[PDB]
């Protein structure tokens, strides 16, 4: 839900896999378990927790408090029923669904948000229900259930984009677009960060900037950064929060690998141990290394091993297999030269290949018109 | 997109045996290599 | 009647086969007349003209 | 012959474990093949004839038809039964050098079934002889205890062929120390011999040199861009205009088949 | 005997295939003459213009 | 051997005669018929004798190109009396192996031919001098007529391009 129990219960990823940081997560998890009715989440995730000595102590109180608040919400729902009114019943069933989201049960919250989903007097309240399903869909990390209500509730707005409602849906677009590997369409989502504010519901502002600095720093080239973020005052204002981001931006834009490789271990360690950003940590590393190799190798035709080894600050035996794997596997440039131990490429990818970029659509289109010939008479 | 999972699985699975991360080792390989 | 349908049918084979080059001539000539009359009715539209409403 | 085909499934299954004779069912069992689908007989029957055709290392036919057969039969079960045809599928796929792993299928059966074969089916790409030779027999129980160890005892000698094929997709010219020592094969005889066998294929070009003992190479594999282009894509223009021209016939004749009745 | 039913039978079937080729020439004349009537109707239309 | 009735008992020399058949097919450069023939032979009749796996291992070594394994493995053949026939196989493949190793793309030095080629008996330097017909330099083998072909004058391909244009007006404008 929108309560801090989404983040406290969201730290279960770093609570489960690593055993070193599993002390603070169980510290604020066990301490914060008495808040927002955290019984069912940690009881389901009890396998990654301590023994049953202190576990069975508070369960007797939480199981009766859950029934007390549940029967009080049922009494309020019965008092609001059989009466002339729309917002009262929607607030009763909606509050019951919010408590059922606090306990973490999507069955009674599924039928509850289905009933109040059918009692929507306007489309804005319906989109609010959709967001109420997204705030728990982030914890449940479901794929289609979060795209169905947004795909159906996306069209037919007719009321214009609000300041933080449509921007909040844009933040959700940043969430599911950072989860997926789609970047060329996600590089335009965070452009409205000026209207964003500190939203304790899903992600803090510093966490939103910290999460978008990877897709923006890697998924964008130098002109895209110079136009979008370098020209904008957003990163110019928020760079003072953490001095490291300024180093990873001025070092990458300045093409200084001596500090980039020495300080890249912080990006490697911080990149993992995250809820939604950890399973994709391998794509940012390789994509950023091939992006930097294409950046430096773009303006450089021939490169000796001296200036390259001194520039990157690493042995030749490692960049040898690096380029060996990234020429065939990565497919970034043409054949490499090693007759004089000097990387020398040609890259004839403009004159003839610029016209040869359509031969793929010509061959696939040729098979497609062969299928068109297959449709003939059958 | 399952199209990118071929390269991500190629390099990710390729490095699953040894030198998985290798980013933490460069700091020790700078002075030795 | 039974065996005569072959040799009697050959007359229809020649009468229908002879129409190939004929329909070739029509489809190759009627489009030349189509562009002739098309340019004849197209050249009627002249630059000097009056503007109405 | 539906019932006769179902009897042929159990007879061929009786001939599946140990028959190994190909004088009758091969080139004699092949019949007119009437409409016999049953929506499952393509999966199980094609899996049977693919298991029979899996002894000669079929690379083109059994790949596409057995992968399609894996894509068939989704009605009842596509997880508990497709794990074996998927196992043999990737086993015969890793022989070509390019082994596609599990990407579009998410089920907790092929994972546990593929865990012992995973490290080696990924170890085929790198192609290490001495280490992986001991890694296979180290913990190898099921994939080598499957019987007669035929395809794996041929794979132990196929590692060098998949590796040299990875070199064929990799750089063309061969060095004397870097890539020869990297491939665990320091022998200028079979190196230049196999590389020459790759030159006589016609898909790539290379050269050999000897000045002080090391093998030099100009490694100019520049594409035909600005190098005899007319002779390069001349047959591409003629062939593409012939296929697109018979496609123009294929868009001129159907209109005749349309106006034929009216 | 067995000739008029077998020899003239396969010769009559070959004559039916010849009738199929004359059906290809036939319907080619049909659609070619209908399209010919279309072009003649358009050129006759601009003739009316 | 190839009969419908399977009641015929398999003879002990059947695999031997089929081994001589594979030796003849591999000797006559018919290795394609061997590749398409590798399907019927795996019947698992004995699979413990070295003669059953000998043709497939020797042919696989032929595909690998490692000739040192065959020469060092010459003493591994048992007392079976086809060793002289194996020497005949080497006598009928020495022209293909020696012919492919002496292609002479750019240049090769004799210090390698001493190891790749056979013993110091002057049979290859005499027969190959009258077979290949090349020049003999100062203890070195020179290679001529390598990438020396002059490109076309663009006259004939222009004529065939004109004929292709004629065919384009033909096929593109035939029914009209």
Curated annotation (Swiss-Prot), chain A:
The keyword Transport does not apply. The keyword 4Fe-4S does not apply. Keywords: Proteasome. Residues 182-350 form the PCI domain. Pfam families: PCI, RPN7, RPN7_PSMD6_C. GO terms for cellular component: cytosol; extracellular region; ficolin-1-rich granule lumen; nucleoplasm; proteasome accessory complex; proteasome complex; proteasome regulatory particle; secretory granule lumen. GO terms for biological process: proteasome-mediated ubiquitin-dependent protein catabolic process. It comes from the Eukaryota. Component of the 26S proteasome, a multiprotein complex involved in the ATP-dependent degradation of ubiquitinated proteins. This complex plays a key role in the maintenance of protein homeostasis by removing misfolded or damaged proteins, which could impair cellular functions, and by removing proteins whose functions are no longer required. Therefore, the proteasome participates in numerous cellular processes, including cell cycle progression, apoptosis, or DNA damage repair. Component of the 19S proteasome regulatory particle complex. The 26S proteasome consists of a 20S core particle (CP) and two 19S regulatory subunits (RP). The regulatory particle is made of a lid composed of 9 subunits including PSMD6, a base containing 6 ATPases and few additional components. Belongs to the proteasome subunit S10 family. This is 26S proteasome non-ATPase regulatory subunit 6.
UniProtKB/Swiss-Prot annotation, chain B:
Expressed in limb bud, craniofacial primordia and skin. Coiled coil: none annotated. It is found in: Nucleus. Component of the 19S proteasome regulatory particle complex. The 26S proteasome consists of a 20S core particle (CP) and two 19S regulatory subunits (RP). The regulatory particle is made of a lid composed of 9 subunits including SEM1, a base containing 6 ATPases and few additional components. Belongs to the TREX-2 complex (transcription and export complex 2), composed of at least ENY2, GANP, PCID2, SEM1, and either centrin CETN2 or CETN3. Component of the homologous recombination repair (HR) complex composed of ERCC5/XPG, BRCA2, PALB2, DSS1 and RAD51. Interacts with the C-terminal of BRCA2. Component of the 26S proteasome, a multiprotein complex involved in the ATP-dependent degradation of ubiquitinated proteins. This complex plays a key role in the maintenance of protein homeostasis by removing misfolded or damaged proteins, which could impair cellular functions, and by removing proteins whose functions are no longer required. Therefore, the proteasome participates in numerous cellular processes, including cell cycle progression, apoptosis, or DNA damage repair. Belongs to the DSS1/SEM1 family. This is 26S proteasome complex subunit SEM1. It comes from Homo sapiens. The gene is SEM1. The chain holds residues 38 to 70 of 70 of the full protein.
UniProtKB/Swiss-Prot annotation, chain C:
It comes from the Eukaryota. It is found in: Cytoplasm; Nucleus. Component of the 19S proteasome regulatory particle complex. The 26S proteasome consists of a 20S core particle (CP) and two 19S regulatory subunits (RP). The regulatory particle is made of a lid composed of 9 subunits, a base containing 6 ATPases including PSMC4 and few additional components. Interacts with NR1I3. Interacts with PAAF1. Interacts with TRIM5. Interacts with ZFAND1. Belongs to the AAA ATPase family. Component of the 26S proteasome, a multiprotein complex involved in the ATP-dependent degradation of ubiquitinated proteins. This complex plays a key role in the maintenance of protein homeostasis by removing misfolded or damaged proteins, which could impair cellular functions, and by removing proteins whose functions are no longer required. Therefore, the proteasome participates in numerous cellular processes, including cell cycle progression, apoptosis, or DNA damage repair. This is 26S proteasome regulatory subunit 6B. It comes from Homo sapiens. The lineage of its organism: Eukaryota, Metazoa, Chordata, Craniata, Vertebrata.
From Swiss-Prot, chain E:
It is found in: Cytoplasm; Nucleus. It comes from the Eukaryota. Component of the 26S proteasome, a multiprotein complex involved in the ATP-dependent degradation of ubiquitinated proteins. This complex plays a key role in the maintenance of protein homeostasis by removing misfolded or damaged proteins, which could impair cellular functions, and by removing proteins whose functions are no longer required. Therefore, the proteasome participates in numerous cellular processes, including cell cycle progression, apoptosis, or DNA damage repair. Belongs to the AAA ATPase family. Component of the 19S proteasome regulatory particle complex. The 26S proteasome consists of a 20S core particle (CP) and two 19S regulatory subunits (RP). The regulatory particle is made of a lid composed of 9 subunits, a base containing 6 ATPases including PSMC5 and few additional components. Component of a complex with USP49 and RUVBL1. Interacts with PRPF19. Interacts with TRIM5. Interacts with NDC80. Interacts with PAAF1. Interacts, in vitro, with the thyroid hormone receptor (in a thyroid hormone T3-dependent manner) and with retinoid X receptor (RXR). Interacts with ERCC6. This is 26S proteasome regulatory subunit 8. The chain holds residues 11 to 59 of 406 of the full protein.
């Amino acid at each position: 839900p929108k309560n801090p129990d989404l983040r406290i219960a969201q730290l279960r990823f770093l609570l489960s896999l690593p055993e070193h940081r599993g002390d603070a997560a169980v510290r604020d998890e066990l301490m914060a378990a008495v808040r927002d009715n955290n019984m069912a989440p940690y009881y389901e995730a009890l396998c990654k927790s301590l023994d049953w000595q202190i576990d069975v102590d508070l369960l007797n109180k939480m199981k009766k408090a859950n029934e007390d608040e549940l029967k009080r919400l049922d009494e309020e729902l019965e008092d609001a029923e059989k009466n002339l009114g729309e917002s009262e019943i929607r607030d009763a069933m909606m509050a019951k669904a919010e408590y059922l989201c606090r306990i973490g049960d999507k069955e009674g919250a599924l039928t509850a948000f289905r009933k109040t989903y059918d009692k929507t007097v306007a489309l804005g309240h319906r989109l609010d229900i959709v967001f109420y399903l997204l705030r728990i869909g982030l914890f449940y990390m479901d794929n289609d259930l979060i795209t169905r209500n947004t795909e159906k509730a996306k069209s037919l707005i007719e009321e214009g984009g609000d300041w933080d409602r449509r921007n909040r849906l844009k933040v959700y677009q940043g969430l599911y677009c950072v989860a997926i590997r789609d970047f060329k369409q996600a590089a335009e989502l965070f452009l409205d960060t000026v209207s964003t504010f500190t939203s304790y519901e899903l992600m803090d502002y510093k966490t939103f900037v910290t999460y978008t600095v990877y897709v923006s720093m890697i998924a964008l080239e130098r002109p895209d950064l110079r136009e979008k973020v370098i020209k904008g005052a957003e990163i110019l204002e928020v760079l003072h929060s953490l001095p490291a981001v300024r180093q990873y931006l001025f070092s990458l834009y300045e093409c200084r690998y001596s500090v980039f490789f020495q300080s890249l271990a912080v990006v490697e360690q911080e990149m993992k141990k995250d809820w939604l950003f950890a399973p994709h940590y391998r794509y940012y590393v390789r994509e950023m290394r091939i992006h930097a190799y294409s950046q430096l190798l773009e303006s450089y035709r021939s490169l000796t091993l001296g200036y390259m080894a001194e520039a990157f600050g690493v042995g030749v035996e490692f960049i040898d297999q690096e380029l060996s794997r990234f020429i065939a596997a990565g497919r970034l440039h043409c054949k490499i030269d090693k007759v004089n131990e000097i990387v020398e490429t040609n890259r004839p990818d403009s004159k003839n290949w610029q016209y040869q970029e359509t031969i793929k659509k010509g061959d696939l289109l040729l098979n497609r018109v062969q299928k068109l010939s297959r449709v003939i008479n059958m | 997109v399952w199209e990118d999972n071929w390269d991500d699985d190629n390099v990710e699975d390729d490095f699953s045996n040894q030198l998985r991360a290798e980013l933490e080792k460069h700091g020790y390989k700078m002075e030795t290599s | 009647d039974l065996y005569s349908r072959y040799k009697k049918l050959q007359q229809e084979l020649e009468f229908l086969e002879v129409q190939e080059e004929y329909i070739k001539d029509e489809q190759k000539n009627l489009k030349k007349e189509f562009l002739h009359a098309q340019e004849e009715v197209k050249r009627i539209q002249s630059i000097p003209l009056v503007i109405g409403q | 012959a539906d019932g006769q085909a179902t009897l042929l499934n159990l007879l061929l299954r009786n001939y599946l474990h140990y028959s190994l004779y190909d004088q009758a069912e091969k080139l004699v069992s092949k019949s007119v093949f009437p409409e016999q689908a049953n929506n499952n007989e393509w999966a199980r029957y094609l899996y049977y004839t693919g298991r029979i055709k899996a002894i000669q290392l079929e690379y083109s036919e059994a790949r596409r038809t057995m992968t399609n057969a894996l894509r068939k039969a989704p009605q009842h079960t596509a997880v508990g039964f497709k794990q074996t045809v998927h196992k043999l599928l990737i086993v015969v796929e890793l022989l070509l050098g390019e082994i596609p792993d599990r990407l579009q299928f998410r089920q907790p059966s092929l994972k546990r079934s593929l865990m012992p074969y995973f490290l080696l089916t990924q170890a085929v790409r790198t192609g290490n002889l001495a280490k992986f030779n001991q890694v296979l027999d180290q913990f190898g129980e099921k994939f080598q205890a499957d019987g007669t160890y035929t395809l794996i005892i041929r794979l132990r000698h196929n590692v060098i062929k998949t590796g040299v094929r990875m070199i064929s997709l990799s750089y063309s010219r061969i060095s004397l120390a870097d890539i020869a020592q990297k491939l665990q094969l320091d022998s200028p005889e079979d190196a230049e011999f196999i590389v020459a066998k790759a030159i006589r294929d016609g898909v790539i070009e290379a050269s050999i040199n000897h000045e002080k003992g090391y093998v030099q190479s100009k490694e100019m594999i520049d594409i035909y861009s600005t190098r005899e282009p007319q002779l390069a894509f001349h047959q591409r223009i003629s062939f593409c205009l012939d296929i697109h021209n018979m496609s123009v016939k294929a868009m001129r004749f159907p209109p005749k088949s349309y106006n034929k009745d009216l | 005997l067995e000739e008029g039913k077998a020899g003239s039978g396969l010769r009559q079937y070959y004559l039916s295939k010849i009738e199929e080729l004359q059906l290809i020439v036939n319907d080619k004349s049909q659609n070619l003459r209908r399209l010919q009537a279309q072009r003649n109707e358009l050129n006759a239309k601009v003739r009316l213009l | 051997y190839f009969d419908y009735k399977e009641q015929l008992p398999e003879s002990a020399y059947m695999h031997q005669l089929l081994g001589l058949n594979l030796l003849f097919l591999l000797s006559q450069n018919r290795v394609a018929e061997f590749h398409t023939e590798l399907e019927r032979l795996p019947a698992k009749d004995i699979q413990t004798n070295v003669y059953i796996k000998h043709p497939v291992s020797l042919e696989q070594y032929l595909m690998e190109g490692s000739y040192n394994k065959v020469f060092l493995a010459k003493g591994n053949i048992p007392a079976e009396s086809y060793t002289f026939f194996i020497d005949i196989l080497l006598d009928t493949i020495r022209d293909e192996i020696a012919g492919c190793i002496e292609k002479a793309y750019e240049k090769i030095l004799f210090t390698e031919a001493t190891r790749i080629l056979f013993f110091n008996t002057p049979k290859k330097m005499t027969d190959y001098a009258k077979k290949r017909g090349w020049v003999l330099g100062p203890n070195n083998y020179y290679s001529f007529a390598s990438q020396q072909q002059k490109p076309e004058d663009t006259t004939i391909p222009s004529t065939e391009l004109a004929k292709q244009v004629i065919e384009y007006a033909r096929q593109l404008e035939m029914i009209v």
